[PDB]
Amino acid sequence: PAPFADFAPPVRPQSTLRRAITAAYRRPETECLPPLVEAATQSKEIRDAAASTARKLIEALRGKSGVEGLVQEYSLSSQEGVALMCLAEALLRIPDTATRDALIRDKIADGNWKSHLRSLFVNAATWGLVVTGKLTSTVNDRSLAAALTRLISRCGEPVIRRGVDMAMRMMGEQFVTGETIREALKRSKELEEKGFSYSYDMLGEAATTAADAERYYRDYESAIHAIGKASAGRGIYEGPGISIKLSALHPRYSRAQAARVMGELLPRVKALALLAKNYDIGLNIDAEEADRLELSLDLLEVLCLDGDLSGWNGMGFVVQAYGKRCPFVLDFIIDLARRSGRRIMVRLVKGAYWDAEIKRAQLDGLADFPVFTRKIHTDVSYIACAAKLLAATDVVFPQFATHNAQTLAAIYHMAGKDFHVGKYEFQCLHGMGEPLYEEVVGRGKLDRPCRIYAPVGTHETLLAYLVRRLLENGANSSFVHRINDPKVSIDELIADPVEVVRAMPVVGAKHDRIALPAELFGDARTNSAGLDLSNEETLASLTEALRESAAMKWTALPQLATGPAAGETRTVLNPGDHRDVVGSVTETSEEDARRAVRLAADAAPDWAAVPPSERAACLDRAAELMQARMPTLLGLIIREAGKSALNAIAEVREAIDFLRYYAEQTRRTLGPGHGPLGPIVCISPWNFPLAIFTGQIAAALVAGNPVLAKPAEETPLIAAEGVRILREAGIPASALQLLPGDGRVGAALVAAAETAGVMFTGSTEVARLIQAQLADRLSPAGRPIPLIAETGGQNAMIVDSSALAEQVVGDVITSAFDSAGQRCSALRVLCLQEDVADRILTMLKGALHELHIGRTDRLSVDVGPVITSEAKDNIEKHIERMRGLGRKVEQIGLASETGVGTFVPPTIIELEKLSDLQREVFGPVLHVIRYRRDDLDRLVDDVNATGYGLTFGLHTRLDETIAHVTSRIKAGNLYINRNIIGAVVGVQPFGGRGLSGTGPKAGGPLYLGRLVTTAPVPPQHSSVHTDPVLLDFAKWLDGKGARAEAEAARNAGSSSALGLDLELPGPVGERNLYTLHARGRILLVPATESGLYHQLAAALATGNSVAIDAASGLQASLKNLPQTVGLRVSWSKDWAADGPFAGALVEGDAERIRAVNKAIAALPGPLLLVQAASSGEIARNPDAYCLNWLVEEVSASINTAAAGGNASL
């Protein structure tokens, strides 16, 4: 099959009208507004009349809550009100009323509610919104528990009774019209008698599995029967209808899965529409995320052209006025209504996903947002689109869904004097819009109809996305919020958004406080740009660029300083299809690898002499080149490395980000005194063959070191292209040599006499072999050769019973199986609290079977091949061993076309204990364990016990659990309520501890400092906190008379950055934190008393404990230590028995250092970051031991939108 011949063909040819929609997707905001202002303009007479009507409605609204009266009656604090409603919610989970009342009277009111009632406070963020109007993303469950005890002990049964009755009313009658469709229908008769109509919302969305989509289907079908029976021939305008969400009806509702959507989702909608046709009721397709808009149009088109649905005008469709495509979508819909002769019911809304759209465009590095960023722009867009709809009432049925009295009044007068039922209507939300619309419906008011959008569902169903619904009308910019704010005048509320926009100095300017994705980092650096795989223009352009990349004769050669070298040449094959030859590699002889190091050494002074700013300029130029070449680079990564387009885009972004980040960090730090190490050997893996390749090399180069680049033998072509780009950007050939080949080439480079440093990403075993070889050598200055190694992980995610299953499953499927699990960060062990384990596991297995595995030149492929047949064999041997032990194994079936490549099906293996898993299994293999809540702390121990410490995830809403878990886990990259993959340079600096590597973190501020002989002070690198054991030690030194060492100890205490705690700039809806902690226990190998004191001061000032070499004979130098210091001090004769250590400090002459370095490399377990100094160096240089390498970096990324919305926005 020809590469990319079927990458992403559209569902249908894009008509002129469809293309005008796509063209507007991310149009600059200043370009969208002027035509909207013009279309929204009305006569001065109309504007005055509309302001009068709006003032009249608002005066009525203000002239006429339950939770607030309850808070007042019992003098509750906010936390008490929230805690009370959480208790009421839990009591309502008890089905029998008499049982519940007995528990309240006999057990709850009397004392400890904790012994009788899953945290009570799982939904406290929602109840917090109800009580306070403010959204907090996580729940302070200890504060709520205290508040609940306090209020119960103060007020007793009466307050509990009142809370229960209040929650019962709100959850049964306010947030929903009824629990079931029959109950909702019964409660609809009252307002139907007043002139209202209804559209029922069954509260389904985001199917994760086929079974869940089928459940949502049968729920919609049963509701259509009930609504149609009740409609009883009233028709689509007077009678009730239904609203559906396409995401409820298929678990893979996305553009990437468009073929499955048209084949599998479309027939389901058609079947529901046929039933709606027979009863003659409305069936409305709700609008969802911006990347689903254009896909949904293909379903609308097919349905409106399907003759089986003819004769029925009930098909409806929502368009969101906050979207830049809205008027063009309306043009398309009106034309479709004309062609089909179906009077499409068009619900105009403003839009419910605003904060999520802002976050998504920022995360994806896209050109602009697909929605407006000023609320007034959405208001003008709405009015302009209403004008378009009101001119087409013969062709469509406009439905103006809004609670904004000003918007309503403007449209009411825009529509003019003539009205008949069926011309158009208004719409509102149940339990929210009735106060406004009771001033609209009826001959005594404005005599215009209103359809009530009526949620229907149980308590569990309505709570799932209640936060997003509350924010529709609850944000500070929301009309319903502002009308209830006394500080907001009626004049402010009736302000005409059209005229306000028209008079702004720059019409349609972007919000001042929302950064475009490119500007996320401000003046520090330019964000890399992504590509929108939902944009048909992008998919069409990418299709051609990808095909063109597959026709190129890609090569990789040994590129020595003197020119390309001869060698053994072989082809490079696509891992997804070995018949697809991607290019040819000429591999490096061991002789030429040694020669390359000599040439690098000869060239080292000339590269070091290029000033740091100019070296950084080379990196910035290379980043521009990679950005411009992204589509071609994507094609090569897809075919050579077996990656999906989505992952290839992110990888090229990461490479660009490394180049720009290290360039900026260089401009912030490097001066004449930060001399280069010399030739650095950069050994890189096949799983991030551009990004990690580029990151290591760029850092070494910009620090002033010439580089020998040894790429993974599986992925030399993208590496050769990366070197070509860096050379084009100005890196001299003598500064950057490419040495393709296998481990023998890597080993020859490591062992070469002039090698001054090694940067390695790959296996622990190979890093250990490199460490053993480097320990044989010292630099010309008699110091160890630095090794930076990142070596993978055994990464866990802990999920408690407060987490949202659908969120968990999505993050798990992505974290475990993205890139076929070939990320070092991939989720390996999912840990499920016992009470939710079976439900989440069922959902996870169902989601597993929705993944498409195959050759990655198709947008529809989710999981590609593993890199080699040997990798495949190793992974499969692990799976079969687990199966042979009787562990439950779930696997997706592989298509026959996978046989030409090396594929492993995504797999779920259920384990009894974490210790059942003994080694990192570098493939799409998720292990699942269950835990009881009281065993959480033991579980964290179990996770730490593997010895790894790279990525870690936690899904919980509860602050106590966040605090506990994050304080006890020992990993470098933590992720809360999100996936654990795709660390962003400079936002989640990436790297771990233990068996996961040495540090410092790539994409972090300590990285460049390891690549120079004297480390600079990184930006923001300081701490006002002083370690108290360090202070006790300095006092002990003064008491012993060691006044010089006591001063040095105090200086180390101040110099240490232990306790640094920063928030890094990044996308909205996330908090990204970076902190410096102690490393652990540092091995001290002193030679003199003063050396031991200096070593102890360095280690204690950075928060560490120590093990001191008993063979030093210096035990008598540490007599009568304070207990606080003694607690941190042990003496070690057998270093291997007393580990693991987290670093080492060595004192001695060159031969002593070499001997100790060899002994240290022989210690089992983690590679130790070793620092050595002579006694004279300790006396001359206060920084003989650099404190940068005695702290541990920790990155934590918290998804603050996880509760369903973004409070900050």
Ligand SMILES: Cc1cc2c(cc1C)N(C[C@H](O)[C@H](O)[C@H](O)COP(=O)(O)OP(=O)(O)OC[C@H]1O[C@@H](n3cnc4c(N)ncnc43)[C@H](O)[C@@H]1O)c1[nH]c(=O)[nH]c(=O)c1N2
């Ligand atoms: C009957 C019915 C049916 C639906 C919906 C509402 C109603 C009444 N909604 C929700 C709707 O889109 C909207 O979020 C709420 O109705 C509130 O908007 P109003 O016009 O009431 O108020 P209001 O006039 O106060 O407008 C609030 C809206 O302004 C927008 N906004 C806020 N800040 C902004 C900013 N900084 N920049 C740009 N825009 C900003 C948002 O769209 C926000 O919801 C919806 N929504 C949806 O996406 N799909 C759907 O299928 C439905 N269905």
Ligand SMILES: NC(=O)C1=CN([C@@H]2O[C@H](COP(=O)(O)OP(=O)(O)OC[C@H]3O[C@@H](n4cnc5c(N)ncnc54)[C@H](O)[C@@H]3O)[C@@H](O)[C@H]2O)C=CC1
């Ligand atoms: N941390 C990560 O991101 C990576 C970790 N791994 C782990 O390693 C396992 C094996 O995969 P491999 O590709 O075998 O990784 P590997 O670690 O053997 O290869 C990594 C790099 O080291 C080079 N290399 C191999 N032996 C060497 C030696 N003796 N001296 C110097 N350089 C040497 C290779 O050529 C490649 O460039 C994987 O299954 C996975 O567990 C591998 C690749 C990525």
Ligand code: PRO
């Ligand atoms: O599309 C057309 O040409 C005809 C006109 C009326 C409805 N269909």
Ligand code: PRO
């Ligand atoms: O976090 C991730 O998924 C990638 C893997 C290497 C570093 N960044």
Ligand SMILES: [Mg+2]
């Ligand atoms: Mg290998």
